[PDB]
Amino acid sequence: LTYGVALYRFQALEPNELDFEVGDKIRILATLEDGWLEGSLKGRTGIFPYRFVKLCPA
């Protein structure tokens, strides 16, 4: 029920990272340690920094 709107481009480098562009709407799956979140976008799941998105209720 929580989604993150990307404010910054996040180029995935690690295999478990979620790649996204500004304006992409990411479904938040979990809040991880050290400022990372797990999310889903276009059928893909991965981790990304919380600071790159704006969280919205939904």
According to DSSP, residue 50 is labeled G
Q: What share of the chain is helix, strand, coil (3-state, %, to 5)?
A: 5, 50, 45
CA dihedral of 55, 5, 10, 18, whole degrees rounded to 10? 80
Q: Which domains does the chain have, with CATH numbers?
A: 1-58 (2.30.30.40)
- Beta strands across the sheet bearing 25-31: 44-49, 36-41, 25-31, 3-6, 53-56
The residue with tokens 């990304």 is: 48
From which experimental method does this structure derive? X-ray
Amino acid at 10: F
Count other C-beta atoms under 10 Å from residue 18's C-beta: 24
Name residue, tokens 């939904």: 58
At residue 24's C-alpha, the angle toward residues 29 and 5, to 5°, is 65
